[PDB]
Structures are given as structure tokens and as C-alpha cells.
């Protein structure tokens, strides 16, 4: 995963419950050039350089035509544990907002990633 895209993508397709935020970060960093971008995500607005981890997953899920579920898997434990196990909390508003509004709620002001 960490350096090669397709294996990550296959793992994500095979065993989403098993990917970890740091493995998404690794893949994205090893395969894309990142440029900070503002983006909105349903209710939330991220300025450039803000919630970069989220910025990376959304932009990577856009390049990769990831469905809503696989995109949430990319957030690893912050999704599977912090957020999914706790509906009454307001922890990690990019995850919580994407769960509601999904890909329709995402909107980049500018392109965040380009393949190396």
C-alpha cells in the first residue's frame, strides 16, 4: 500500500475495515503532488491547508472515483471508531458531514492533487 496505488486500491476494495489513516496518507504522499486547497463539505468549510488529511482523502477519492463507503474507509479508525461508534458526538466534522451529504456535498475551490 504505502507506496503503490493499485495495491492500496485493491486492499481498500477487499478489506476497507482494515485500512488505517496513516496508510491512506502514505499512498497519497507517495503517488501525488499535493497542493493545499479550500473545499466545502456539506455544512463545513475548510480553508486551504485546513483539515489537510480530509482534503487529501476527498481529492484522492475524486481522482479515483471512490464510492462514499470506500472514501470513509480511507479515514481508518477516525471513521470506524471515533465517528461510526459515536453518533451523538461532533468529533471530526469532515467525516460526519460527508456521511450525510456524501460526494454531492464536496466541492473543491481548486485542485488538490496531481499524479506524480
Q: Does 99 bind a copy of itself (CB under 8 A)?
A: no
Instruction: Pick the closest to residue 91 from 24, 40, 44, 47 (CA basis).
Output: 44
Q: Report the SS3 class of residue 108.
A: strand
CB of 78 to a copy of itself, least distance (A): 20
CA–CA dist 4, 27 (Å, integer) = 6
Task: Scan residues 45-74 and list those touching Na ion (CB under 5 A).
Answer: 63
Q: Does 67 bind a copy of itself (CB under 8 A)?
A: yes
Q: Does 113 bind a copy of itself (CB under 8 A)?
A: yes
The x, y and z cell numbers of residue 11, run together, are 486492499
- Which does residue 102 touch among Na ion, a copy of itself, K ion, none (CB within 5 to 8 A, set by kind)? a copy of itself
Q: Does 64 bind a copy of itself (CB under 8 A)?
A: yes
Q: Which residues contact 100 (CB under 8 A, 6 or more apart)?
A: 42, 43
Note the residues at the interface with Na ion (CB under 5 A).
63, 107
Amino acid at each position: 500500500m504505502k507506496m503503490e496505488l493499485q495495491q492500496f486500491l485493491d486492499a481498500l476494495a477487499s478489506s476497507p475495515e482494515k485500512i488505517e489513516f496513516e496508510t491512506t496518507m502514505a499512498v497519497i504522499e507517495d503517488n501525488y503532488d499535493f497542493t493545499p486547497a479550500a473545499f466545502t463539505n456539506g455544512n463545513t468549510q475548510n480553508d486551504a491547508n485546513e483539515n489537510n488529511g480530509s482534503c487529501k482523502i476527498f481529492a484522492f477519492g475524486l481522482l479515483n472515483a471512490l464510492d462514499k463507503e470506500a472514501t470513509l474507509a480511507c479515514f481508518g479508525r477516525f471513521y470506524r471508531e471515533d465517528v461510526l461508534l459515536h453518533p451523538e458526538n461532533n468529533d471530526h466534522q469532515n467525516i460526519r458531514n460527508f456521511m450525510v451529504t456524501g460526494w454531492e456535498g464536496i466541492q473543491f475551490e481548486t485542485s488538490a492533487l496531481t499524479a506524480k
